[PDB]
Amino acid sequence: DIQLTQSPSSLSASVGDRVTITCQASQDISNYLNWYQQRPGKAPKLLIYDASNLETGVPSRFSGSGSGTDFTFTISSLQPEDIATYYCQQYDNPPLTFGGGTKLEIKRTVAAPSVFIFPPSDEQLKSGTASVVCLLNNFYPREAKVQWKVDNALQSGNSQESVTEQDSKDSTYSLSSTLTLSKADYEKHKVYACEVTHQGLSSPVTKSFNRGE
Amino acid sequence: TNLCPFGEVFNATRFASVYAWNRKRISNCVADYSVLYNSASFSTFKCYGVSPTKLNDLCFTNVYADSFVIRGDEVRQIAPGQTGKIADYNYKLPDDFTGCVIAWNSNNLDSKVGGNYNYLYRLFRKSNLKPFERDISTEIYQAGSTPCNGVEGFNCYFPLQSYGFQPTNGVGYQPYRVVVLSFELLHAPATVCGP
Amino acid sequence: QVQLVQSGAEVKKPGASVKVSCKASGYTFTSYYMHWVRQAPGQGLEWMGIINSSGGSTSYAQKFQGRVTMTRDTSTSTVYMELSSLRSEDTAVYYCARPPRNYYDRSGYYQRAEYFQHWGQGTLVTVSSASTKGPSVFPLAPSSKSTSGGTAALGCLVKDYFPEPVTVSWNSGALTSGVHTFPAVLQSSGLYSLSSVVTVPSSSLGTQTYICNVNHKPSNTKVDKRVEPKSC
Amino acid sequence: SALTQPPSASGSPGQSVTISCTGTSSDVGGYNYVSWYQQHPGKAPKLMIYEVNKRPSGVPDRFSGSKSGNTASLTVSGLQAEDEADYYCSSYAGSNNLVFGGGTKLT
Ligand SMILES: *[C@@H]1O[C@H](CO)[C@@H](O)[C@H](O)[C@H]1NC(C)=O
C-alpha cells in the first residue's frame, strides 16, 4: 500500500494567482501518478495523467511535473471555475491510493448579501410546525451574522444555517437560516425579523414581516 | 523475397494530412515486423490486442497501414476510446482495436522557416467520426443559428485549419508522424504472415 | 458520447448487503476494465477493485476481501458491485470508472494505464437503523414585495426527509440560472431538511410559471410544487 | 439609421421601462442574435443582454430582454438612479454584418 500525502490540505488564492500543490509518495512510482479535480456534488474529473500529460480538453493553464516520490501540480492563472478539491492517484502497484485532497478556494473582493425573508407556508401551519427562512444571496466572505428577532426579542438555539459551496462563476456564497417553531409559539408573537450583519454591509440589514398579512 | 513494403509507408517522402489520412493495404507478402520493433527511432510505440514481439508468428486476413501527421500532444488521441479534435473529427480508432500505433517526431522534415501550412486538421464537424472514417468535405461549418449560405462569416467557419508548424515550437506543438497498423482477421484466407 | 449510469441511492440496515449497478453506453463494453471507487462523506477517495468486462476476472482490495463481489452482464453492458456486512464506515458514494485500454510496450511489456477518464454520477449508500421517511415540500413565497427592485427570490423547502439525497430542479430542469440548492441539514429529530431558492426578474413573476420538482428516490416520493407569491 | 430605437424613453423608480428596437425580418425578426448595451456618458459600453434574453455574469435580474416579431424589447424593472444611461441594441444583419441602433437615453 503506497501512501500519498498532499500539501497543503487547504488554500485560498486570488484570481490570476499561480497555485502549486505537492503530492509525496511513500515509495517510488516513476510517473504513474494522475491528478483529479472533484467539484462539490459531482464526480472526479481527470486533468493530468502520467504526472505530466494534460488530458484532452483541459485548459493550457494546468500543468503537472515530478518523478520518483515527489510530484507537483500547477495552475498558471487561477480562474473562478477552478474551485474544487484536487486529488492525486497512483497506479504503479496495487492497490490504487488517493491523496488527502486539497480544497482550493478563491480570494475575492468583498460583496454584500441580498437579504430575503420567507414566512411559513399556509400549508405547513396545518401540520403544527412553522418554519421561517432567511436567505443571504451572493455575498463574500463566507462569514456572516444572522440574528432572529421575534417581537424584537432575540431567539437562540432554534435556528439552523446552511451555506452553499463557492460559486464557480462569481465566487460568492449563499446562506439559509431556518427558524423552526411550534404553531402555538409562532402564533404567540407578531413581528418576525431577520437581522444580517456582514462585512460588505455598512449597517445591519433587517428584513421583517408581520404575522397574518 | 516478396517482403512487405513497410519502408514505402514509414520512409515515404511526403505524408498526408490527418483529415485526409492515407491508408495502404497490405496483402500477399511476408511481414518482418522486427524492422519496426527493433528500431529505437520511435517516440511512442503502443500496441492494443496484440504484442509486437508475437507478431512475426501470426497470420491475419488483411493489414492496413494508415499514415498521417499531427501535432505532439494530439498524438495521445490516436488510441481506442480517446476524445478530442483529432479523435472526433479527423481519425477515430475503434474501441475493439487490434493493432499498433507508432509515432515519431518529424520536426526537421515537416516544419520550415516561417511555418509549414501544408498540414491541416478538421476543427469542426456536425457529428463525430465512425471508426476508420475519412471526411475531406470542405463545407462551411454552421456553428450558430445563421444559415452561412456557403460563405464563411458570423458563426460560419472553414472546417479545416492549418497546424502552423514553426521550428521554434515546443515539443507539444511539433509535427509528429503517425502510422497505425490494423490487423483484421475475417473469415478469409490469411494472406499476411511472418517467419 | 460515453455514459456511465449508476443505480439510485439506497439506505440499508447495518449488516445487510447493497448492490450498485453501473450501465455503460456509447462504447464497446467488453473492451475496457471497470474499477470501483468509494468516497465517504467529507473524506477522500478509496479504491475498491477492478473487474474485467470481457472474461469476468476480478481483483478486490484487501480491505474489502471476502465482503465485496463484482458482477458483470455483457448482454445489458452493465457492472454490479455488491458489498455485504455493511457498517457505518461504508456510508459513502460509490463511483464506477473506466480507464483506457492497457497497451503493450515496444519491447512487449504489458503496460497498465489505470487513469480514470469516465466516471458515473455516484450511488449514495446510507447505512442506518433509522427507517426511511418521505419529505414534505413547502413553497417559500416572496410575499414581501421584493419585486420592487427588479429581482424576486422564490424557493422550496424540503423538510423532514430521510435519508439523503433529494434532487430539486426548477421547471423540470429548464431553469438553472440563479438556482441555489442549499446543502441538507441534519435536524435534532434525526431527519434532513433543505431549501432551494431561485432569483428571477420581477417582470417574469406573472408571465412565466415557476414549478419546483423534488425527487426522493429512497422513498419513491416525487412532488411538484407551484410557487406563487403571496399577495398581502 | 438602419434601426428604429426611440431616442428618449423615460421612467420612474420602482416602475418598469420598456425600450423598443425595431428592425425587419432580415435582421431582428429572423435570427436570435440580439444584444442590449448600456453606456454611461464618457464610459465604454457594457453588455446587459445578449442572444435576446441572456443576462451575462454580473448583470442584475432587473434587466430582462425579450422579442416579438420584428421588435426586441429591454425591460428595466427595478429602476434606480444609476440606470440613467444610453441603451443601444445590436443585431445580426447577415453574414459579416452587425447593425447597431440609434440609442435610447433612459431618464
Ligand atoms: C527507413 O530508412 C532507414 C535508413 O536507411 C532504415 O534503417 C529503416 O529500417 C527504414 N524503414 C523501414 C520501415 O524500412
Q: How was this structure determined?
A: X-ray
Binary contact (D95, B152; C-beta < 8 A): yes
CA distance C125 to C20: 9
CA dihedral (B163, B166, B170, B176) positive or negative: positive
- Contact present, C65 and C5 (Cβ < 8 Å): no
What total number of domains does chain B contain? 2
Q: Are residues C198 and C93 in the same domain?
A: no
Instruction: Say how many CA atoms lie within 13 Å of A117 toward its Cβ.
Output: 22
Residue nearest to atom 9 of ligand 1 (CA): B35
Q: Are residues C101 and C182 in the same domain?
A: no
Considering only CB atoms, D75 lies closest to which of C147, C151, C203, namely C203
Given the CA of residue B6, which atom of ligand 1 is nearest to it?
Answer: 13
Q: Are residues C121 and C32 in the same domain?
A: yes
Report which of C221, C101, C215 is spatially closest to residue C167, judged by C-alpha positions: C215
CA distance C188 to A213: 31
- Contact present, D74 and D48 (Cβ < 8 Å): yes
- Contact present, C154 and C206 (Cβ < 8 Å): no
CA dihedral (B111, B114, B116, B122) positive or negative: positive
The verdict on residue C19 lying in a domain is yes
Give SS3 for D103. Answer: coil
Q: Three-class SS string for A40-94?
A: CCCCCCEEEECCCEECCCCCCCEEEEEECCEEEEEECCCCHHHCCEEEEEECCCC
User: B2 CB under 6 A from ligand 1?
Assistant: no
Tell me the residue range of the domain where B136 lies. 115-166
Q: Give the Cβ contact number of residue A114 at 10 Å.
A: 20
Residue indicated by cell numbers 434574453? D53
Q: Which residue of B has its CA nearest to D33?
A: B145
Picking from C110, C127, C144, the residue at the C-terminal end of a domain is C127
CA distance C214 to C106: 55
What is the least distance, in Å, from the CA of C28 to any CA of chain B? 6
Residue A173, beta-bridge partner list: A139
What is the least distance, in Å, from the CA of C178 to any CA of chain D? 10
CA distance C49 to B34: 37
Residue D74, beta-bridge partner list: D19, D65
Q: Are residues B18 and B90 in the same domain?
A: yes
Give SS3 for B189. Answer: coil
Q: Are residues B82 and B127 in the same domain?
A: no
Q: Are residues C115 and C140 in the same domain?
A: no
Q: Are residues C168 and C193 in the same domain?
A: yes
Backbone angles phi, psi at B103, to 5 degrees: -135, 145
Asked if B80 has any chain C CB less than 8 Å from its own CB, the reply is yes
What is the residue extent of each domain of chain D?
Answer: 10-107
Q: Are residues A8 and A102 in the same domain?
A: yes
Instruction: List all residues 6 or more positions away from A176 whose beta carbon is below 8 Å from its beta carbon.
Output: A133, A134, A135, A136, A161, A162, A163, C182, C194, C195, C197
Binary contact (A164, C183; C-beta < 8 A): yes
Binary contact (C150, D55; C-beta < 8 A): no
Q: Are residues B137 and B63 in the same domain?
A: no
Q: Give the Cβ contact number of residue C214 at 10 Å.
A: 22
Tell me the residue range of the domain where C97 lies. 3-127
Resolution, Å (one decimal): 3.4
Q: Are residues A21 and A98 in the same domain?
A: yes
Which residues on A lie below 8 Å from C205 (Cβ)?
Answer: none
Picking from C82, C103, C127, the residue at the C-terminal end of a domain is C127
CA distance A92 to C109: 14
Q: Are residues C118 and C155 in the same domain?
A: no
Q: Are residues C113 and C197 in the same domain?
A: no
Residue nearest to atom 13 of ligand 1 (CA): B7
Which residues on C lie below 8 Å from A34 (Cβ)?
Answer: 115-116
Instruction: List all residues 6 or more positions away from A49 whose beta carbon is below 8 Å from its beta carbon.
Output: A34, A35, A55, C113, C115
Asked if A160 has any chain B CB less than 8 Å from its own CB, the reply is no
Report which of C67, C70, C92, C66 is spatially closest to residue C12, judged by C-alpha positions: C92
Q: Are residues C118 and C215 in the same domain?
A: no
Size (chain A), residues: 213
Q: Are residues B11 and B24 in the same domain?
A: yes
CA distance B177 to B14: 10
Chains that touch C (3 or more CB pairs under 8 A): A, B, D
C-alpha C166 chain-centroid distance: 9
CA distance D25 to D67: 12
Grid cell of C78 as nine digits:
452493465
Which residues on B lie below 8 Å from A64 (Cβ)?
Answer: none
Binary contact (D96, B149; C-beta < 8 A): no
Binary contact (D96, B148; C-beta < 8 A): no
Which residues on C lie below 8 Å from D38 (Cβ)?
Answer: none
Q: Which residue of C has its CA nearest to B81?
A: C100
What is the least distance, in Å, from the CA of A30 to any CA of chain D? 43
- Residue A62 maps to which CATH number? 2.60.40.10
The verdict on residue C154 lying in a domain is yes
Q: Give the Cβ contact number of residue D15 at 10 Å.
A: 11
Tell me the residue range of the domain where A123 lies. 114-210
What total number of domains does chain C contain? 2
Please calculate the CA angle C98-C103-C106 and round it to the nearest 5 degrees: 165
Grid cell of A32 as nine digits:
504513474
- Residue C145 maps to which CATH number? 2.60.40.10
Grid cell of B50 as nine digits:
496484440
CA distance C41 to C20: 18
Q: What kind and span of H or E run contains C160? A: strand C151-161
Q: Are residues B50 and B121 in the same domain?
A: no
Considering only CB atoms, B145 lies closest to which of D31, D95, D98, namely D31
The verdict on residue C172 lying in a domain is yes
Q: Are residues B189 and B126 in the same domain?
A: no
Interface test with C, best of A85, A116, A166 (most C CBs within 10 A): A116
Residue nearest to atom 1 of ligand 1 (CA): B11
Q: Are residues B121 and B157 in the same domain?
A: yes
Which residues on A lie below 8 Å from D58 (Cβ)?
Answer: 170
Q: Are residues A31 and A84 in the same domain?
A: yes
What is the 8-class DSSP label of residue C90? G
CA distance B23 to B12: 13
In terms of DSSP bridges, do strands B99-105 and C18-25 run parallel, antiparallel, or are they unpaired?
unpaired
Q: Are residues B75 and B139 in the same domain?
A: no
Picking from C127, C149, C166, the residue at the C-terminal end of a domain is C127
CA distance C98 to C23: 12
Q: Are residues A96 and A136 in the same domain?
A: no
Backbone angles phi, psi at C35, to 5 degrees: -110, 155
Q: Are residues C142 and C180 in the same domain?
A: yes
Which residues on B lie below 8 Å from A53 (Cβ)?
Answer: 73, 76
In terms of DSSP bridges, do strands C92-98 and C118-119 run parallel, antiparallel, or are they unpaired?
antiparallel
Q: Are residues C34 and C16 in the same domain?
A: yes
Chains that touch D (3 or more CB pairs under 8 A): A, B, C
Asked if A57 has any chain B CB less than 8 Å from its own CB, the reply is yes
Give helix then strand counts, H and E, for chain A.
Answer: 1, 19
CA distance A67 to A24: 10
CATH 2.60.40.10 applies to domain D10-107: yes
